[PDB]
Amino acid sequence: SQVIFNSVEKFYIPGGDVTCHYTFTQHFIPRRKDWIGIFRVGWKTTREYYTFMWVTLPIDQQEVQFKAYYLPKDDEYYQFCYVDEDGVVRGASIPFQFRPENEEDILVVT
Amino acid sequence: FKQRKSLAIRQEEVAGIRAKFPNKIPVVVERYPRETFLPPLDKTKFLVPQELTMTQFLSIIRSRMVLRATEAFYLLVNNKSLVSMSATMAEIYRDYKDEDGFVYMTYASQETFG
């Protein structure tokens, strides 16, 4: 709703850092304990985050970077969620997997 | 690789492959297990054009060898089937395709069937 994720990939290569792109809607006011976290799809509560980053500062079309080490190892679906200081999710991305789109043993012939 | 993956998992892999490349034929290529001479591949699944001949496909397989071997060798569908090397992948798929949606090939420099 109030926070929107852009350029979210369906696939993120394991071992690469993930740049998360987000934009605040016109009437949304970000706060400094606000955060972005990566949730298994089907998360029940915001306390279930796999990994997180604080909303990036300072704030003047935003991005935050997730280091490869802290990213999910498995084949499950995840999404970005924006959680404000009150514990309220203000935006959630399309789902994605941490995995090559094409497994490496695959060779495309043209 | 019927032993590593379940029928449904393989059918799913074919589904995904076909969704990204609906025009290709998915081919599982495997080194004859008793091969002592030819080197292994850096690739397992080959997504090939319908019109590609068995010969051209053999040259591709050769190009994926982790060591360089110029020697002639055999391409056996299912490891049971000697086929015309002038045959296109479309024909091999029509005639030899596995129930899971994959075509299987074994490459060997020599083999003795029972």
Residue numbers in the entry:
A (entry chain A): 21 to 80, 88 to 137
B (entry chain B): 13 to 126
Which passages does the manuscript contain on this structure?
Autophagy receptors target cargo to autophagy by binding ATG8 on autophagosomal membranes. In this study we discovered that the ubiquitin-binding autophagy receptor NDP52 binds preferentially to LC3C, in contrast to other autophagy adaptors including p62 and NBR1 that nonselectively interact with several human ATG8 orthologs. NDP52 comprises an N-terminal SKICH domain of unknown structure (aa 1–127), a central coiled-coil forming region (aa 140–420) and a C-terminal ubiquitin-binding Zn finger domain (ZnF, aa 421–446). We determined the crystal structure of the NDP52 N terminus (aa 21–141) containing the SKICH domain and CLIR in isolation and in complex with LC3C.
The NDP52 CLIR was disordered in crystals of apo-NDP52 but became structured in the 2.5 Å complex structure of NDP52 bound to LC3C. Similar to other LC3-LIR complexes (Noda et al., 2010) and to SUMO-SIM interactions (Hecker et al., 2006), the CLIR forms a short β strand that fits into the canonical, hydrophobic LIR binding groove of LC3C. As expected from the NMR data and mutational analysis, the interaction is driven by extensive hydrophobic interactions of Leu134, Val135, and Val136. Ile133 of the NDP52 CLIR β strand is at the Trp340-equivalent position but due to its shorter side chain does not occupy the aromatic pocket and is therefore largely solvent exposed. And in contrast to canonical LIR β strands where the first and fourth residue mediate binding, the CLIR-LC3C interaction is dependent on three consecutive hydrophobic residues, the Leu-Val-Val motif, which occupy position two, three, and four of the CLIR β strand. Val136 in position four and Leu134 in position two of the CLIR β strand cooperate to occupy a complementary, smooth hydrophobic surface on LC3C in which the Leu-pocket is less pronounced than in other ATG8 family members. In addition, Val135 on the opposite face of the β strand exploits another hydrophobic wall of the LC3C binding pocket, formed by Phe33. However, it also improves shape complementarity with the hydrophobic CLIR pocket, and enables additional interstrand hydrogen bonds between the CLIR of NDP52 and the β2-strand of LC3C. While the LIR of p62 forms three backbone hydrogen bonds with the β2-strand of LC3B, five bonds are formed between the CLIR and LC3C, which may partly compensate for the missing aromatic-pocket interactions. The N-terminal α1 helix of LC3C is disordered in our structure; it is possible that this helix is stabilized by acidic residues upstream of canonical LIRs (Noda et al., 2010).
